[PDB]
Design a protein around this nucleic acid. Structure first.
Ligand SMILES: [Mg+2]
Ligand SMILES: [Mg+2]
Ligand SMILES: [Mg+2]
Ligand SMILES: [Mg+2]
Ligand SMILES: [Mg+2]
Ligand SMILES: [Mg+2]
Ligand SMILES: [Mg+2]
Ligand SMILES: [Mg+2]
Ligand SMILES: [Mg+2]
Ligand SMILES: [Mg+2]
Ligand SMILES: [Mg+2]
Ligand SMILES: [Mg+2]
Ligand SMILES: [Mg+2]
Ligand SMILES: [Mg+2]
Ligand SMILES: [Mg+2]
Ligand SMILES: [Mg+2]
Ligand SMILES: [Mg+2]
Ligand SMILES: [Mg+2]
Ligand SMILES: [Mg+2]
Ligand SMILES: [Mg+2]
Ligand SMILES: [Mg+2]
Ligand SMILES: [Mg+2]
Ligand SMILES: [Mg+2]
Ligand SMILES: [Mg+2]
Ligand SMILES: [Mg+2]
Ligand SMILES: [Mg+2]
Ligand SMILES: [Mg+2]
Ligand SMILES: [Mg+2]
Ligand SMILES: [Mg+2]
Ligand SMILES: [Mg+2]
Ligand SMILES: [Mg+2]
Ligand SMILES: [Mg+2]
Ligand SMILES: [Mg+2]
Ligand SMILES: [Mg+2]
Ligand SMILES: [Mg+2]
Ligand SMILES: [Mg+2]
Ligand SMILES: [Mg+2]
Ligand SMILES: [Mg+2]
Ligand SMILES: [Mg+2]
Ligand SMILES: [Mg+2]
Ligand SMILES: [Mg+2]
Ligand SMILES: [Mg+2]
Ligand SMILES: [Mg+2]
Ligand SMILES: [Mg+2]
Ligand SMILES: [Mg+2]
Ligand SMILES: [Mg+2]
Ligand SMILES: [Mg+2]
Ligand SMILES: [Mg+2]
Ligand SMILES: [Mg+2]
Ligand SMILES: [Mg+2]
Ligand SMILES: [Mg+2]
Ligand SMILES: [Mg+2]
Ligand SMILES: [Mg+2]
Ligand SMILES: [Mg+2]
Ligand SMILES: [Mg+2]
Ligand SMILES: [Mg+2]
Ligand SMILES: [Mg+2]
Ligand SMILES: [Mg+2]
Ligand SMILES: [Mg+2]
Lengths: 126, 56, 102, 18, 46, 110
RNA sequence: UCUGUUUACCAGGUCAGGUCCGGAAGGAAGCAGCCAAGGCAGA
RNA sequence: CCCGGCGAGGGGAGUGAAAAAGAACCUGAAACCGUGUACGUACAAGCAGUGGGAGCACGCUGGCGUGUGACUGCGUACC
RNA sequence: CGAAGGUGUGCUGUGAGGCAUGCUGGAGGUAUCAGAAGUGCGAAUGCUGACAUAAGUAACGAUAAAGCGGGUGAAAAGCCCGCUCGCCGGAAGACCAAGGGUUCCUGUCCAACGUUAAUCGGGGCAGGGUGAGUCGACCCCUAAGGCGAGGCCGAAAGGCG
């Protein structure tokens, strides 16, 4: 299935090649709707991600749903960061579990095409 | 037929005096795994009387 | 005929800021003004990824009723009240006490 | 390929606007 | 069983429709009363 | 030190929930958690939830050791009840009450 | 007492990653991985 | 921040004079439903009170209040 | 330095009542003597709202019928997948007109709605979807019937043609 093992290797294979100026120029439809400068700090944030996924025991990665308050104190202490950042990293991983299970069920073309860019009313940004 | 006078909360209490549930007293502890469970029922891991008789 | 305007230096008569002085950012229609260094509130902001807005407690400046601020006389060092006269053919503001133009 | 471009594109990017 | 309202559009509109009212004195009085009570719709029209 | 956890506007009548609530009153929360696990009722899972939440509250906020906790006060109050309508025969209709309730659990080391 | 494997933080040692102090020299608390070690077993 | 289903709801934290002001939001009455404590109740007949009254509990400074009311006299709602 | 109102408690009057005061409340209240009254509630099978009672009772909408494996998932008797079983088949199938008006299809969500759960839906939110010289409507022609220039009639409105 999809774990923080494959997420570990996803983000450590993606911390080699990952950049925000090379990947905000490889899509013309998503850099015109949401702002082109909301991309990322790739080295900071992917070395953060790899740090936080190094702070985990291996069945905490292969079974991400058993991570609770004490586990996040221990992870946030391990790499020298805030419990909230580990919260939002397990958030990001949750979204990617959503997306790759959706890519598992739906054929690659019907889950990459039905992908939607979204605003709260037709007026720009609000 | 339908009642003649509004029965008081008193009566209503009495009638319900018997309606209390019985908490199950014993939680049997399986030998091998050690998890608690019902007498004669298999565990959450499918253990019974020391076997793992369900793989699940 | 509007007495208090953008960029006037004012002094605050009422509230937790009583006695403090500052510079007007802008005015609002409801008769509220927003003044520099005045009436800070601590506001909680849910982090917004589209605007790259971090979360946290932002100290912001909250509108204050324009009745509560007085136009600050720099000459006298006192709060003042304002009036209007016609100099040249133009409508102009002045301080009531020393009757000098602004 | 196709699953590496569908990986990386909406990974880097859909981690950006969300 | 067979109830009282068996709907028809052409029927509905020939009987109560705008033009049907306007045809007569009485009808225009209906439309007067309605306009005076300030209804959202006077008659039945689509 | 006393700690609260509440669940408000749960669907179940106060009455039905009371049955279960009155099973666990007074026990230490371990033994009580199990009582609840093997009770077959709906109210059982509601109240299980609230109790567990209560434990989390105690430990994380007030720094209580889980072993010591008992259930000191547990009470189910009436909630806002919603009217509906069930049609009945010969045309009469029936204002229905879908009842809710407030499950309130409070634990203490003492 | 060898070998098979188990035990997140809250026994130990190594402590990668990352993080604190320092301009630099370097230290440091320590998450994971490993080995003690404690569960449970083949003898 | 924490429990939970990326829920519902809750608990801390923070704003505020106040959050028993939290949007199911001024004040928050009664019926109605409960949790806790005192007292009484499992040989007892009736518009449920009133008169008498033992004990028990709690307040006081051996007496005075408060709650309860075993036991007995009389006692068939209101319009 | 805490008004009205809410809740207690204590004191006082022959009575409706009054005074004082603990909590609650957080900005209005009102002596005295006069004045005006939408002036006092338990009943009216009174009117509105709220909450009881019977009671966790009756009931859960055709007596065509279910069983298992796997999937998804917080949770699967009910959802998807597979396998057997069973019912309709001059219909419980397929196509229209009427009538409805988005219920269609996809994704997503589960508070309320669905007489249970619901991960499912004819429910919620977002998107998509209806392509005509030759199919219909329109259009050409009239039926019954309607309206009806002039006209006849009628107090007025109007009736008949
Ligand atoms: Mg009778
Ligand atoms: Mg019973
Ligand atoms: Mg009917
Ligand atoms: Mg919440
Ligand atoms: Mg404060
Ligand atoms: Mg309320
Ligand atoms: Mg107010
Ligand atoms: Mg209120
Ligand atoms: Mg109240
Ligand atoms: Mg009350
Ligand atoms: Mg005898
Ligand atoms: Mg006796
Ligand atoms: Mg009797
Ligand atoms: Mg007496
Ligand atoms: Mg005493
Ligand atoms: Mg006494
Ligand atoms: Mg006494
Ligand atoms: Mg007596
Ligand atoms: Mg008498
Ligand atoms: Mg008698
Ligand atoms: Mg006060
Ligand atoms: Mg007062
Ligand atoms: Mg008044
Ligand atoms: Mg008062
Ligand atoms: Mg008062
Ligand atoms: Mg107050
Ligand atoms: Mg106050
Ligand atoms: Mg008064
Ligand atoms: Mg008077
Ligand atoms: Mg009156
Ligand atoms: Mg009344
Ligand atoms: Mg009377
Ligand atoms: Mg009646
Ligand atoms: Mg109402
Ligand atoms: Mg009723
Ligand atoms: Mg009842
Ligand atoms: Mg019965
Ligand atoms: Mg029965
Ligand atoms: Mg029946
Ligand atoms: Mg039955
Ligand atoms: Mg049915
Ligand atoms: Mg299953
Ligand atoms: Mg199944
Ligand atoms: Mg079925
Ligand atoms: Mg099937
Ligand atoms: Mg046949
Ligand atoms: Mg028809
Ligand atoms: Mg149609
Ligand atoms: Mg709709
Ligand atoms: Mg559909
Ligand atoms: Mg759908
Ligand atoms: Mg339902
Ligand atoms: Mg069910
Ligand atoms: Mg549910
Ligand atoms: Mg729908
Ligand atoms: Mg044709
Ligand atoms: Mg003709
Ligand atoms: Mg004519
Ligand atoms: Mg005619």
């Amino acid at each position: 299935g999809f774990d923080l093992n494959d997420f570990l290797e996803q983000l450590r294979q993606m911390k080699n090649m990952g950049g925000x100026x090379x990947x905000x120029x490889x899509x013309x439809x998503x850099x015109x709707x949401x702002x082109x400068x909301x991309x990322x700090x790739d080295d900071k944030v992917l070395v953060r991600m790899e740090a936080i996924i190094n702070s985990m025991t291996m069945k905490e990665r292969a079974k991400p749903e058993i991570i609770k308050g004490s586990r996040k104190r221990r992870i946030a202490a391990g790499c020298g960061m805030q419990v909230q950042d580990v919260n939002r990293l397990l958030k990001q991983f949750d979204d990617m579990q959503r997306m790759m299970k959706k890519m598992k069920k739906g054929g690659x073309x019907x889950x990459x095409x039905x992908x939607x860019x979204x605003x709260x009313x037709x007026x720009x940004x609000x | 037929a339908v009642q003649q006078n509004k029965p008081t909360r008193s009566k209503r209490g009495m009638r319900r005096s018997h309606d209390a549930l019985t908490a199950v007293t014993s939680l049997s502890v399986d030998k091998t795994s050690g998890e608690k469970h019902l007498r004669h029922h298999i565990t959450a891991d499918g253990y019974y009387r020391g076997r793992k008789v369900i793989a699940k | 005929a509007a007495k208090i305007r953008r960029d006037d230096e004012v002094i605050v008569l009422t509230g937790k800021d009583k006695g403090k002085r500052g510079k007007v950012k802008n005015v609002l229609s409801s008769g509220k003004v927003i003044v520099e260094g005045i009436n800070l509130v601590k506001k909680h902001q849910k982090p917004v990824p589209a605007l790259n807005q971090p979360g946290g407690i932002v100290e912001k400046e909250a509108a204050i009723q324009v009745s509560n601020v007085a136009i600050f006389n720099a000459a006298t060092g006192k709060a003042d009240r304002v009036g209007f006269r016609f100099e040249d053919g133009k409508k102009v503001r002045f301080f009531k006490s020393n009757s000098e133009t602004i | 390929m196709k699953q590496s471009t569908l990986a990386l594109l909406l990974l880097l990017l859909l981690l950006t606007p969300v | 069983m067979k109830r009282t309202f068996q709907p028809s559009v052409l029927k509905r509109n020939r009987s109560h429709g705008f033009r049907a009212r306007m045809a007569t004195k009485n009808g225009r009085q209906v439309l007067a009363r309605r306009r005076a009570k300030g209804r959202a719709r006077l008659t039945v029209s689509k | 030190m006393e700690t609260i956890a509440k669940h408000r506007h749960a669907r179940s009548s106060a009455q039905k929930v009371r049955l279960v609530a009155d099973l666990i009153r007074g026990k230490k929360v371990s033994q009580a958690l199990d009582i609840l696990t093997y009770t077959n009722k709906k109210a059982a899972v509601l109240v299980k939830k609230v109790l567990e939440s209560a434990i989390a509250n105690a430990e994380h906020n007030d720094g209580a050791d889980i072993d010591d906790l008992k259930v000191t006060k547990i009470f189910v109050d009436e909630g806002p009840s919603m009217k509906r309508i069930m049609p009945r025969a010969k045309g009469r209709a029936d204002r229905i009450l879908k009842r809710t309730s407030h499950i309130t659990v409070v634990v203490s080391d003492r």
